[PDB]
Design a protein around this ligand. Structure first.
Ligand SMILES: Nc1ncnc2c1ncn2[C@@H]1O[C@H](COP(=O)(O)O)[C@@H](O)[C@H]1O
Ligand SMILES: Nc1ncnc2c1ncn2[C@@H]1O[C@H](COP(=O)(O)O)[C@@H](O)[C@H]1O
Ligand SMILES: [Ca+2]
Ligand SMILES: [Ca+2]
Ligand SMILES: [Mg+2]
Ligand SMILES: [Mg+2]
Ligand SMILES: [Mg+2]
Ligand SMILES: [Mg+2]
Lengths: 398, 398
């Protein structure tokens, strides 16, 4: 089972820790350790660049976890978000002094509703016109009945969701665009294409408001069926703005000044999972070749380079430490002088570090270092003054 | 009142929106709009670089909002975190099927406890030895009795907290180091030093476990007393690891292999507020000189450059759009061709954009553009092929 092996590596090296481990934990709750917080941040950076700020037609928001309760009546979650005896899967809390119906709030089960209710605000302040999107990354909460499979299905998780508002007659081509774009995003960041597939929902598996839904599925390797949903890309017609306009009383239609027409945009929704993606990138990268290597895209790898003096000899520290401080101004780096150099390469390979930089006794005469590439183990001798440039060309886009 | 004027600008331009505005909102709940999410991200980036990954002695974590309940008994929050009739300020929720004492959990009122309970995990996986720190950014929740003053004191907020673990005999010099370093961080990012001060807590205002606490205070401009706490920097002695070791039964002391000694580290804690800092940076940057200019540090400004064709003429779009696409690969940028150019400069000044790049009819012959600097309004004519380099030298560290 690749999955358990990857989970064990993730714990051993501090990608993750069980939350509250010393108190026995809480079911499905995982903390991100020193390497995990950096990998998670890198995934966020790549999504935000590809979907939001790298585009001229998508803007971002960060809306609150706790919204007014009526948001979740309008969205239908109060009446429908239940799994059987029906049990509602939203987490409740109480705000203010007394516990009353007025104080009752839900923690959001998805980030998307905070986008929809801000549609008119964003049109106004960002001066946007369909086709355009609003993207968001954040925490969501669900009282999952059977959480587990590591971080695949947890009660507290993070999503990366974008709502793309379009003229209704253009929705089918924009849906296809976003299906194609989102699938390719995973492949471009290194997931092997044979471990990804698309699942076109049959008509009898569509929501009442979706004209089409396609899931990107990843071959996680679960027992039984090894595939799982990674990201859902839905054509949500005009249901979301319509329902919030009806329940709130605020017009959420769009006025097209050029063609003087008013309409309610259709929505194409790429709904991805930050913590679920983290799991897929780790599993897919895990390789046993003997070598254990985490073949992470260099833009995702948590540590970009490790500075490794050949030994603890005092003559090598000045250079090695000076080099580490220079590189640390640019990237997250590691410094390690403990034990045999070959074992130190293997320690970095195991967590995906794309380059190791070795300072040896020849470095004291030629003022150069050896740079080792993780996967092929090529070793180039590089002038000290050129190491950062050498790394930068190979880490571009991080 | 500068504060109301800044809040109004923040709403009008989409730094913030009231959460769930169309449903009447919830007290103290603010969403971050297109400009606000970028400013908030930039503040996070600068803190994480200065306190965590730019250092060789601090690592990061991202622990769960919902931890095992016993964490908050051990920390003393269940018995002490109450304001009078006593009222506990932690937000509660229930996990799993039935609402039972076993299902009751608290949303974290601070991020620091998730750091302490992972001390031994981080020592193990990151191979750290005091003096070293663990930093974290994340959401915290408090049932504030009188929330308000915009985003200064809200029920849902974000903190930037680091716990610096030291040999006990070194705590006083490390405390002073971190006081000095954290104060200077705000000044380096552009807050005017006359609007910052330190408040040394008198002995009768210290917690039972703090040997010394110093607050960084900012002159927000509140009615009555215009100063407010911005960040607290406390020497927390050995209370935090000791209490968790006692309640959990897990030894959280540190073993020093070199000197073969075992001890419980003292803790120096810089506890900052991401959303409170956001407010201070905006207020301090707001300037009326007539001009309204948000004098934000270019590393914090949400939009780094705006590409502005002199007019909507079709001959200027090809170049202006090509230039925008080139710059967008590097930074968040804006493109605006609506209305008089001078009003468009002022629109960018109002949100802090450090540079405007104007494409005019002379650009079609000399293949150069004018770059305007926000504060002084200097205008340099810059070759198209050099614009990104020109901006990069001025945006270094973003
Ligand atoms: N309980 C969960 N734990 C982790 N990720 C989730 C969970 N539920 C949904 N996701 C992620 O969020 C995406 C959108 O979910 P949904 O809102 O159910 O369409 C999914 O494709 C997953 O990547
Ligand atoms: N209710 C709140 N809303 C926003 N920021 C807060 C709130 N409470 C505390 N903070 C921030 O968190 C820092 C540490 O808070 P404390 O945990 O109370 O020491 C403070 O200096 C503020 O910057
Ligand atoms: Ca678990
Ligand atoms: Ca409010
Ligand atoms: Mg959804
Ligand atoms: Mg689905
Ligand atoms: Mg605290
Ligand atoms: Mg305080």
């Amino acid at each position: 089972p690749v999955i358990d092996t990857v989970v064990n590596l993730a714990k051993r090296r501090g990608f993750v820790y069980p939350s509250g481990e010393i108190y026995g934990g809480t079911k499905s709750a995982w903390d991100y350790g020193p390497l995990g917080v950096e990998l998670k941040e890198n995934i966020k950076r790549q999504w935000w660049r590809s979907v939001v700020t790298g585009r001229d037609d998508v803007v971002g928001i960060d809306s609150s976890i706790i919204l007014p309760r009526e948001v979740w009546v309008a969205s239908g979650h109060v009446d429908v978000f239940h799994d059987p005896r029906e049990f509602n899967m939203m987490l409740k809390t109480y705000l203010g002094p007394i516990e009353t119906e007025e104080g009752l709030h839900y923690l959001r089960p998805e980030t998307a509703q905070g986008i929809f209710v801000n549609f008119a605000n964003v049109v106004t302040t960002a001066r946007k016109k369909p086709p355009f999107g609003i993207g968001q990354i954040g925490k969501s909460f669900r009282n999952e009945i059977t959480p587990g499979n590591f971080i695949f299905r947890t009660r507290e998780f993070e999503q990366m969701e974008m709502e793309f508002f379009v003229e209704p007659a253009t929705a089918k081509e924009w849906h296809q665009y976003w299906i194609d774009n989102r699938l390719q995003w995973y492949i471009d960041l290194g997931i092997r294409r044979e471990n990804l597939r698309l699942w076109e929902h049959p008509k009898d598996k569509l929501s009442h408001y979706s004209d089409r839904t396609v899931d990107i599925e990843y071959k996680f390797g679960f027992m039984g069926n090894p595939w799982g949903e990674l990201e859902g890309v839905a054509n949500r017609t005009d249901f979301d703005l319509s329902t919030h306009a009806r329940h709130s009383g605020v017009d959420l239609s769009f006025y097209d000044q050029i063609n003087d027409v008013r309409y309610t945009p259709y929505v194409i929704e790429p709904a991805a999972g930050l913590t679920r993606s983290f799991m897929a990138f780790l599993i897919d990268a895990y390789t046993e070749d003997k070598r254990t290597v985490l073949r992470l895209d260099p833009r995702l790898a948590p540590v970009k380079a490790a500075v490794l003096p050949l030994s603890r000899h005092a003559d090598l520290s000045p250079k090695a430490r000076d080099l580490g401080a220079e590189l640390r101004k640019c990237w997250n780096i590691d410094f390690d002088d403990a034990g045999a150099i070959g074992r130190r390469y293997r320690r970095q390979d195991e967590v995906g570090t794309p380059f190791c930089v070795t300072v040896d006794f020849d470095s004291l005469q030629d003022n150069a270092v050896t740079v080792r590439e993780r996967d092929a183990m090529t070793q180039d001798r590089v002038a000290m003054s050129s190491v950062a440039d050498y790394l930068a060309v190979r880490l571009k886009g991080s």
